[model samples]
Target: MATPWSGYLDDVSAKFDTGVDNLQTQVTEALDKLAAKPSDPALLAAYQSKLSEYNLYRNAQSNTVKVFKDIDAAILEHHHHHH
Candidate 1:
């Protein structure tokens, strides 16, 4: 069975981590494409790179709550299991 809040924090933490990993992949691909070749207009195709960056920023900006909640819940969980 699921461990409730104890495991809930795991899922929450992974959500942020996965978001970061996803954004990092997209970002590094574009940023590297741009940094390695600044003259390539193709790298800026549809402003996707910038748009993706903004999305990543928004994820982190919005993520703060989950982080706080995760830690708070984790602390409370440990407290109860303390024998």
Candidate 2:
């Protein structure tokens, strides 16, 4: 919404999706490792970190959806004002 529509909306969206996809895979792998080494503190720690990273990207994905909605609302409001 800043500067009257910036570029890279698609770029940001794609990167965010990519981040989630990669993180999801890592999280899955981490689980597999933890299951195989249930007593290993290192594996437990890695899984915890992976979960946090996944949540971070998932939150970003949620925020981008909200931002897109806000942009749509702003565009419609601006159109009404001019009309």
Candidate 3:
């Protein structure tokens, strides 16, 4: 059986993975569009916007992962048991 902390850790991990995948896809698509139409101002702006949004999300996800890791560590230390 999983403890509450363990479940929380799993949920955080899954969310982080999903965020990474989504960011990767967004970045790839943006770069592809930029490469294909380098002169289109609208396309370039759209790609840049998407890239910026992706960066924001990536930063948030990174912070969330760090916070969860710290929480998980504290839980383990307090319980004197592995998750």
Candidate 4:
């Protein structure tokens, strides 16, 4: 059985991993399209849009990790106080 802290950590790690994988996949696909046809207007537009979305997701993912860490710390402090 996992402790509450362990479960939370696992959840956060999973979320971060998923976010990173998604970002990487999007970037790779965009670059592939660009490489295949450097001057395709539609591909360029899609790449730009994906890049913008990736940046936003990256920022949100960072904030989420920070929040999770803060929560874990608070939980540890509470446990210490009680024990």
Worst 10-residue lDDT window, candidate 4: 1-10
Which of the numbered candidates is closest to the native, going by highest TM-score?
Answer: 4
List lDDT for all candidates, in order.
0.71, 0.83, 0.78, 0.81
The runs of at least 3 residues in candidate 4 whose Cα sits more than 4 Å from the true structure, single-residue gaps closed, are: 1-18, 63-83
Error of 2 at 7 (Å): 24
Q: Which 10-residue window of candidate 1 scores lowest in summed lDDT?
A: 45-54
Native RMSD of candidate 2 (Å): 7.0
TM-score of 2: 0.50
- Candidate 1, residues 1-83, lDDT tens digits: the string is 44676658878656767767666667667767777776577886523665578586667768786797989899899999996
**RMSD (Å) of each candidate, 1 decimal:** 9.0, 7.0, 7.5, 6.1
What tens-digit string does per-residue lDDT give for candidate 4 at 1-83? 55676758778566667877798689669878988996697997888878887887888877876897999999989999996
Residue 34, candidate 2: Cα error in Å is: 0.4
**Tens digits of per-residue lDDT for model 2, 1-83:** 35332476776556766778799899879989988987587998899999998998787788987898999999989999997
Candidate 3 lDDT for residue 45: 84
Using TM-score as the measure, what is the rank order of every candidate, best first?
Answer: 4, 2, 3, 1
Ordered by lDDT, highest first, the candidates read 2, 4, 3, 1
Best by lDDT: 2
Q: List the residue pairs that clash in candidate 4.
A: none
